[PDB]
Write a protein that binds this ligand. Structure first.
Ligand code: HFS
Ligand code: HFS
Lengths: 400, 398
């Protein structure tokens, strides 16, 4: 019909998950103008005329759409790998966010993942109190921008370094991770990189999973076929670490191994497979049968050791192989201050005391500023460097 | 402006027909970028290969759903127009009858002239005037531009003059409808530059409408325009436009009124005032119009008709219509007892066409057939971008 087609086209122009919605189309044009505005390309009449035909148009667009100078940077609160995270206040709305910058040139400089799609998809659609929420995602010719919610309570690395964690706290934080990972699994993902660095606390001190860069979609039988290893040396499971080109076929059990590593560290103060060099940790992980020991200290309850050992074993016998409910039924979690279905409604072990909406006391101080880093080299022929980032924008077509 | 404003102004742009960033225009830029990249030589780059691999499924389904060529059933070819043909079509779904104009993308690019269609698309779609042929739908593919206009079953004025020895009453009517039609085009901010009986079409009631605006240009601050183009058929073209063979001259709207004078002369005499066997002969006679403009030795043409023709066929500086359109209307040639200017298009036309069906193409001569296969593009070894000049041409109506 002449109307069905008009409607079906309109479903593709609106759907927040359409590859051709208003966001993706405004990006597609925006990418082209960027990837053509070079003197060596302006020699072509078509390219030259098109840019001048759209010059006044494309500027009005870039002024109306969400851009970087719409935000007032308060302080940098994290940096490294492919950019930095900074506490920002939206100049217009005065609302406070945590904005993550991703270097386009750096990611294209051999990263082999295009991982940001998974992270953008989860944070924007998870709709879970256990997941850090994405509000806006925009871009330019140099950086990707993820406007997430601010977590003023800081991460779990900061918490463990300032407190000798008692069991009551450990049980709480382990249980919040178990529920958080269960929510991620329900969406159809294996996290593959569970660690205190990725665990952030809100203004009440409740846990949320942040950064889903290593996330991959599970198949029908809930497995992942990956030939190269992914994760962190201390928290990586034996099967993901040895995962070879032979198969590299593992389930969600790898996430529960990392939860056990997380629990061990909270109580002992060290990683279960620590060594002098990085390569030593590796031999100790493969040898978890004989390397996993508890230091002589009478403060780790029987149930704590039981749970850690149930998580820190081979995939075939590992706790959590028979679903999440058997982890919840474990005696370590048996307490009298909360229940699983009402856990995130109870008072947290460490409620943070905040001075203002911009209180960054729980984040270690950094220099900021930098000095505008190097991006893509100026093309001599049409390269199309902005094409792999078309549709990353989450602004015009977002879910409400 | 607030956040709610900056968002909503942007959101309104994607639904605004007059916007260059509207949903249909954005779908073009993506549809175009796929065509101008899907070549094995450019597939070598991963940024390009990864782009096409993702938007593969999407761009096909989009192309099938949007208004395409096979949505129309061609009834009969009714006109040839340099870059392509005009054909009477019936929309398969709605059964509505239109005149669709095709324009060869390769042919346009081949001989420059690939920007004139913007002026024609903008006028026909937004003019909203009973004197202007209306554009309903404008779509495209990788080869042709498509302009779905209203069908004019009455035919053109070329056909009329060849079948009748036009009397003055008729000439007065048709001249007055052109004057009002061009005045409506000037009011939008345009100089037609190509006023001729080929471009004047009659509706089902036999009333005039200007069709084909492929040479219209936007007037600057002073209401003038610069230009430089190899002129086709100088018969109706003015001295000033002819003396501007290379941007070496600015001219106003008075060049349109000269063409009206040529139009009136032809209706009464039966021939163009500056006709010659060669194209350069016509030009030479137009330049020497001070001495070449003559009248037949039979006083069939009245005093006022001669007065008006001579008033239109003089130098720009003294030409009638320089002081506005109202002095053309006040002329004694138009003095009649059948109609008034403000109610002219409501009166009964001198020739009301008798139509058999909604597809009665009796007022249009049969067209032969090109019998010639159209030239295509060579497979690029780089990025030529032979789709960018046709981005944002797609137009729909509510
Ligand atoms: O992007 S982060 O998740 C991150 C760091 C600091 C504050 C945040 C915050 O407040 N909200 C969301 C994410 C945040 N992060 C931690 C993982 C390691 N790499 C990126 C920095
Ligand atoms: O496009 S045309 O305006 C043209 C020709 C024949 C029928 C039409 C019709 O019915 N409607 C609109 C335009 C039409 N045209 C005449 C001008 C010369 N070149 C293009 C063809």
């Amino acid at each position: 019909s002449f109307e069905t087609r008009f409607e079906k086209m309109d479903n593709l122009l609106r759907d927040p998950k359409s590859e051709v919605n208003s966001d993706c189309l405004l990006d597609g044009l925006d990418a082209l103008v960027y990837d053509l505005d070079f003197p060596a390309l302006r020699k072509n009449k078509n390219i030259d005329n098109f840019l001048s035909r759209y010059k006044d148009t494309i500027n009005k667009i870039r002024d109306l759409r969400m851009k970087a100078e719409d935000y007032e940077v308060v302080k940098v609160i994290g940096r490294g790998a492919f950019g930095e995270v900074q506490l920002v206040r939206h100049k217009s709305t005065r609302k406070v966010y945590a904005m993550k910058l991703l270097s386009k040139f750096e990611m294209i400089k051999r990263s082999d993942s295009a991982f940001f799609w998974e992270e953008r998809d989860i944070m924007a659609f998870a709709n879970s109190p256990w997941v850090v929420q994405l509000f806006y995602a925009f871009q330019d010719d140099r950086y990707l921008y993820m406007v997430m919610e601010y977590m003023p309570g800081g991460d779990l690395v900061n918490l463990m370094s300032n407190y000798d964690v008692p069991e009551k706290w450990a049980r709480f934080y382990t249980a919040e991770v178990v529920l958080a990972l269960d929510a991620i699994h329900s969406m159809g993902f294996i996290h593959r990189d569970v660690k205190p660095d990725n665990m952030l606390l809100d203004k009440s001190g409740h846990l949320k999973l942040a950064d889903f860069g290593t996330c991959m979609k599970m198949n029908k039988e809930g497995m992942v076929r990956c030939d190269t290893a992914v994760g962190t040396p201390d928290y990586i499971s034996p099967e993901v670490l040895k995962s070879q080109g032979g198969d590299g076929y593992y389930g969600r059990e790898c996430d529960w191994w990392s939860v056990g590593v997380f629990l061990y560290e909270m109580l002992v103060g060290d990683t279960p497979f620590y060594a002098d060099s990085l390569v030593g940790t590796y031999s100790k992980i493969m040898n978890h049968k004989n390397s996993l020991t508890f230091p002589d200290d009478n403060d780790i309850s029987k149930e704590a050791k039981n749970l850690i050992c149930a998580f820190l074993t081979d995939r075939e016998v590992r706790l959590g192989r028979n679903g999440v409910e058997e982890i919840k039924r474990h005696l370590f979690f048996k307490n009298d201050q909360w229940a699983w279905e009402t856990l995130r409604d109870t008072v947290a072990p460490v409620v943070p005391d905040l001075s203002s909406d911009i209180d960054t006391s729980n984040f270690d101080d950094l220099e900021e500023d930098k000095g505008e880093e190097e991006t893509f080299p100026i093309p001599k022929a049409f390269v199309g460097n902005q094409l792999p980032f078309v549709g990353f924008t989450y602004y015009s077509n977002r879910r409400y």
